[PDB]
Design an enzyme around this catalytic site. Structure first.
Site, short mmCIF file in Angstrom:
data_model
loop_
_atom_site.label_atom_id
_atom_site.label_comp_id
_atom_site.label_asym_id
_atom_site.label_seq_id
_atom_site.Cartn_x
_atom_site.Cartn_y
_atom_site.Cartn_z
N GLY A 11 20.17 47.69 40.96
CA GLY A 11 19.68 48.95 41.47
C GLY A 11 18.52 48.76 42.44
O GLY A 11 18.32 47.69 43.02
N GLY A 12 17.74 49.82 42.60
CA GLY A 12 16.57 49.77 43.46
C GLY A 12 15.37 49.08 42.86
O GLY A 12 14.37 48.89 43.55
N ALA A 46 8.01 22.30 69.39
CA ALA A 46 7.83 21.96 67.99
C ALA A 46 6.47 21.33 67.75
O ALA A 46 5.84 21.56 66.71
CB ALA A 46 8.95 21.02 67.53
#
Ligand SMILES: O=CCCCC[C@@H]1SC[C@@H]2NC(=O)N[C@@H]21
Lengths: 657, 489
Positions: free
Chosen positions: B150-151, B386
């Site tokens: 669910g939430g 990088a």
């Protein structure tokens, strides 16, 4: 002087010079830029790529390199191309010292054949037996009774142990001759048999020899090389138990007599086979500098390196047989990177995560310092551990203790085998044989187990260590001092043993069964997160090791063996029953490449045996060669991906079936 | 007396109270609220009231230091939240906000309680707001011991670290029934939101444990690292290890060939104290390593590349992982130590179709925004952007070091040679690439410019790190005034 070896012996030589005040030079290959002997040396020169051929074996490079040091002499070493003519010839081309024996003796004695000629030159109690063909069973029985030997039936043209049967009586002689003729006629096209004095059970006694270019020849005390795996020896000892002066004095005198026979200069060593009836057999003689002398040097003090380098300058020795004596005895063992419990699997390419050698009244010769690695194309020996002693019990106990203090991390080894062999009561009985190992290890290798008191002591030490490391994390004075733990090794909690602990001082506890139980007050001294753990209850002393933990399971080593003890409280013990234990997937199927790349090198062959930890192939991607290996399996059935197949994408490179 | 828990243990599962007892000290748990009812009065719920109301909240004490915690209860109503369950959690979080104490929650809820109507949504919203406001003030750790659907899944997400239990836990937004209803595919609960899926694929879970007992045992160890609050200093523990311990094995770790790989842990382990590494997210984006460690008895943060996996190349997942770790470490004044070995970014269409530009900027933002002391060591190579991203000296770095065989260049030798000579005579490869790599693929030029403090022997790394980290103990740096930043989401 310059050495020719890159092992422990090289370090030894560059160490003998310390007292001899002799500047030394040491060459190396590219991979060995960080070997200890390079930094121990005064000078170092590179000898090209580290493959064996170019490395040291490249005489041309080596002999050519011998033109800058100025050293008037150069050690030949003991391995590689030591004592070699093609090398002796080259060094006498440029007119330099060999620090070794003369050619004529070396080729006269190290040669495979004609050694029997020198042997029978003066006889010297060489192999006995009827020298000729036995055409009839009557002759075989008569010559067997002549000496009443175990026959030693062996083919005239056969070698390597084929066509040999051991006869104990006349009927056995006839039956084994009947089998031997049938075997040899088919296998070697020769029916000519010979009968010789077979040995009841051999000990492979070895006699040491030293000499000089002027005189004063001396016989060194003998040694032992009985234990042997795959024709490689493990444990050595100079004053063997079966030693009578009646034999030994004649052994030394006959060794010296044989020495001048071929005018030998740098004596190697004499080989013998000895039966419980105290015989001797001079043959299989050695002409190489055996490095098992540390044992003899421990029972004598005769520095072979110093004496041989002194004799290399045409001077006599500094010792005579009159002062050589015995001050006890010494034990020596060899540490290999060979994983025994796992079918003698070789473990290479692993630098030492971290290692520390045992240095308590013991000697250790090694060329592998911290942060060092072993290539596949070299000797996998780690260390040559030798301990001085005077009594078997004294010298052995020392070894026992010294084995446990050798911290090796980063790769496997055979220390467990050495420990189990030394601790065996058969080895401490006094006498052994050359077939000892496989006799005591029929199926593979299985380390001996622990007695009740040893396991109890391990539990107590584990509890003490747990409490000591627990007290570290607490803040200021809000720390405990007593608990009740429930130790149980194994995934099923076999033998729940309640334990207490009190921590009365920094390195003292009050271990007992539980609360309101008598206490013993042992002692444990261990630095947090370190390997060595010294524990001494009363007189008994033990040394265990601490590998690691996950806060419920402790990885502790006992008698050179890894265990996982569980140290948990009442709640954890009562709750660990109600915990799922899933079984991991046991899949013997095809292996896939995790990432795309290119296959440049392959190691294994299609549809043959594979063992755990074996490299299989190497992909190269974005400038990087990986190496996926075989985690665990017995064999494979598959089709190999060919070289340069830039396909990958999680394909089936090797299929395991 | 072992009543009413036989039904639970029979299913090979533990209870909330047992978990709480295992976590804290033997006798230092004081349950806060225990007699509370739901007062619902709907759909035949006026009966079957429960004293605890499905939650256990207390204070406890770990290693002599205070804590706060709460645990869901699966037996009572499936662990569903309500207008009344959430009140206790809100009170605990508010109290732990006034006092500088962290919060740890063991989630087991089966979803919302339908019989309360929108009151469950109200409680969820209040918990979400408390998590949002107090993130960065007190550390929040969450462990998922059972179902979590669910939430309710969102509140663990906002928390700093989420851990998972292997056999009997899962988490997802929507159940497989709806997936079957709309798409038509039949997927089990474990295949949808199992611990492995979130450990490897989604990157939500920060770790996985085999048992609840091991989970507690290692959660205590993790707690031993954290600082108590936002304003409290980094903890320092006594330790017998010393900075003068010899580490000469680092001289040989880096191979002499540029195309061979090695394990960065062989460099990480010698520098830090013995047996003091706690890896975070070990099975996700293996080309980068993040975790906690101690240096001379004080906790630090470790972020290093790994040439073992994919040549140590930065990526989307690695960028997200490193960014989250750096942000958390800086939020609570924890020093950062980094080891650099990167050839660049991972090339591919999927990367641009997935937004490398957004994700790769997160790590750079996290490194530039940080104000804690930083130490950087360049072992072998650093190319292109990088090098800039991985805590370069220009991003207000404190001290930077390099090893004698390092390389710092704009790009590989081949590309530079190609761009510097358009149509130069053929065979230019042999006599130009070697020369360019010799002349400019070396730390001498970067040292001449002043981008590395000094070139050091690899055996002095522990000494240098301990010295610098001891000296930098009292740095005070501040950013310009802002309501908050705008990080590239
Ligand atoms: O030379 C051609 C491929 C070189 C790639 C080198 C590595 S792969 C990922 C990263 N991105 C680059 O541009 N260089 C590095």
């Amino acid at each position: 002087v310059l050495v020719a070896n890159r092992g422990e012996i090289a370090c030894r030589v560059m160490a003998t010079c310390r007292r001899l005040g002799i500047k030394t030079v040491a060459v190396y290959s590219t991979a060995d830029e960080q070997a200890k002997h390079v930094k121990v040396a005064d000078e170092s020169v590179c000898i090209g790529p580290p493959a064996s051929v170019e490395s040291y074996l490249c005489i041309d490079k080596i002999v050519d390199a011998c033109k800058k040091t100025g050293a008037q002499a150069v050690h030949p070493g003991y391995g590689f191309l030591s004592e070699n003519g093609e090398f002796q010839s080259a060094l006498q081309k440029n007119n330099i010292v060999f620090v070794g024996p003369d050619a004529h003796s070396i080729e006269s004695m190290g040669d495979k054949i004609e050694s029997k000629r020198l042997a029978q030159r003066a006889g010297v109690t060489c192999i006995p037996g009827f020298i000729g063909e036995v055409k009839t069973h009557e002759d075989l029985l008569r010559f067997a009774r002549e000496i009443g030997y175990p026959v030693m039936i062996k083919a005239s043209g056969g070698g390597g142990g084929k066509g040999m049967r051991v006869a104990y009586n006349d009927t056995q002689c006839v039956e084994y001759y009947d089998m031997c003729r049938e075997e040899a006629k088919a296998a070697f096209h020769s029916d000519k048999m010979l009968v010789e004095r077979f040995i009841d059970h051999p000990r492979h006694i070895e006699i040491q020899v030293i000499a000089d270019r002027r005189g004063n020849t001396v016989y060194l005390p003998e040694r032992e090389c009985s234990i042997q795996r795959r024709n490689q020896k493990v444990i050595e000892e100079a004053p063997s138990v079966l030693l009578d002066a009646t034999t030994r004095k004649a052994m030394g005198e006959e060794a010296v007599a044989m020495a001048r026979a071929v005018q030998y200069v740098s004596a190697g060593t004499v080989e013998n086979v000895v039966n419980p009836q105290k015989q001797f057999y001079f043959l299989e003689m050695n002409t190489r500098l055996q490095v098992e002398h540390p044992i003899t040097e421990e029972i004598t003090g005769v520095d072979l390196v110093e004496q041989m380098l002194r004799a290399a300058a045409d001077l006599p020795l500094s010792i005579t047989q009159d002062d050589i004596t015995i001050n006890g005895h010494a034990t020596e063992c060899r540490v290999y990177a060979e994983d025994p419990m796992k079918n003698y699997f070789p473990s290479i390419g692993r630098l030492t995560m971290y290692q520390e050698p045992t240095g308590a009244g013991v000697r250790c010769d090694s060329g592998i310092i911290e942060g060092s690695q072993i290539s596949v194309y070299y000797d996998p020996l780690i260390c040559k551990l030798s301990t001085w002693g005077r009594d078997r019990a004294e010298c052995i106990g020392r070894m026992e203790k010294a084995l446990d203090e050798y911290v090796i991390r980063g790769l496997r080894h055979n220390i467990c085998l050495l420990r189990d062999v030394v601790t065996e009561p058969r080895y401490r009985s006094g006498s052994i044989t050359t077939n000892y190992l496989q006799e005591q290890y029929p199926n593979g290798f299985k380390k001996a187990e622990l007695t009740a008191e040893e396991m109890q002591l391990m539990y107590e030490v584990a509890a003490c260590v747990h409490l000591k490391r627990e007290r570290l994390h607490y803040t200021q004075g809000t720390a405990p001092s007593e608990r009740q733990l429930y130790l149980s090794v194994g995934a099923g909690q076999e033998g729940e043993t309640p334990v207490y602990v009190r921590y009365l001082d920094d390195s003292h506890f009050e271990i007992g069964a539980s609360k309101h139980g008598p206490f013993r007050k042992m002692e444990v001294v261990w630095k947090a997160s370190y390997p060595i753990i010294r524990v001494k209850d009363g007189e008994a002393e033990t040394v265990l090791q601490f590998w690691g933990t996950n806060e419920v399971t402790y990885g502790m080593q006992m008698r050179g063996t890894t265990f996982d003890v569980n140290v948990m409280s009442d709640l954890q013990s009562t709750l660990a029953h109600f915990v799922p234990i899933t079984e991991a997937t046991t899949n013997t199927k095809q292996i896939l490449s995790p990432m795309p790349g290119v296959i440049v090198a392959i190691k294994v062959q299609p549809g043959q045996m594979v063992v755990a930890g074996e490299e299989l192939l190497t992909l190269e991607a974005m400038k990087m060669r990986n190496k996926i290996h075989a985690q665990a399996d017995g064999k494979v059935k598959e089709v190999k991906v060919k070289l340069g197949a830039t396909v990958e994408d999680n394909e089936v490179l090797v299929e395991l079936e | 007396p072992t009543a009413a828990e036989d039904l639970r243990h029979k299913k090979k599962r533990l209870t909330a109270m047992e978990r709480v007892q295992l976590f804290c000290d033997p006798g230092t748990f004081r349950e806060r609220d225990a007699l509370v009812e739901h007062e619902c009065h709907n759909f035949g719920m006026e009966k079957r009231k429960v004293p605890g109301d499905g939650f256990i909240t207390g204070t406890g004490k770990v290693f002599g230091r205070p804590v706060f915690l709460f645990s869901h209860d699966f037996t009572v109503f499936g662990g569903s939240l309500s207008r009344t369950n959430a009140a206790k959690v809100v009170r605990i979080m508010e109290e732990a906000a006034k006092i500088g104490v962290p919060v740890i929650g063991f989630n087991d809820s089966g979803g919302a309680r339908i019989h309360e109507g929108v009151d469950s949504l109200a409680g969820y919203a209040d918990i979400f707001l408390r998590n949002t406001l107090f993130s960065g003030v007190i550390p929040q750790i969450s462990v998922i011991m059972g179902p979590c659907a669910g939430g309710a899944v969102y509140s663990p997400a906002i928390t700093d670290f989420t851990f998972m239990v292997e056999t009997s836990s899962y988490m997802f937004v929507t159940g497989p029934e709806v997936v079957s209803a709309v798409g038509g595919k039949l997927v089990t609960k474990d295949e949808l939101g199992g611990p492995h899926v979130h450990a490897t694929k989604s990157g939500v879970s920060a770790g996985t444990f085999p048992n609840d007992i091991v989970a507690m045992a290692q959660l205590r160890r993790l707690y031993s690292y954290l600082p108590l609050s936002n304003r409290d200093p980094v903890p320092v523990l006594p330790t017998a290890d010393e900075r003068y311990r010899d580490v000469s094995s680092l001289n040989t770790v880096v191979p002499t060939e540029v195309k061979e790989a090695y394990d960065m842990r062989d460099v990480i382990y010698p520098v830090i104290d013995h047996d003091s590494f706690f890896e975070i997210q070990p099975q996700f984006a293996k080309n980068i390593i993040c975790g906690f460690a101690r240096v001379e008895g004080r906790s630090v943060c470790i972020i290093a590349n790994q040439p073992k996996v994919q040549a140590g190349v930065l990526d989307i997942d690695s960028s997200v992982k490193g960014a989250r770790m750096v942000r958390f470490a800086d939020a609570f004044n924890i020093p950062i130590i980094t080891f650099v070995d990167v050839p660049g970014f991972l090339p591919g269409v999927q990367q641009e179709y997935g937004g490398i530009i957004r994700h790769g900027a997160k790590l750079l933002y996290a490194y530039a925004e940080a104000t804690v002391p930083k130490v950087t060591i360049i072992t072998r190579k650093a190319y292109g952007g990088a090098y800039d991203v991985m805590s370069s000296k220009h991003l207000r770095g404190d001290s930077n070091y390099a090893w004698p065989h390092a390389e710092i260049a704009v790009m590989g030798a081949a590309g530079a040679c190609k761009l510097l000579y358009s149509k130069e005579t053929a065979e230019q490869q042999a006599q130009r690439i070697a020369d360019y790599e010799k002349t400019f693929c070396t730390p001498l030029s970067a040292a001449r410019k002043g981008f590395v403090d000094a070139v050091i022997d690899p055996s002095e790394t522990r000494m240098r790190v301990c010295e610098d980290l001891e000296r930098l103990a009292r740095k005070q740096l501040q950013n310009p005034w802002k309501k908050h930043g705008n990080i590239p989401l």
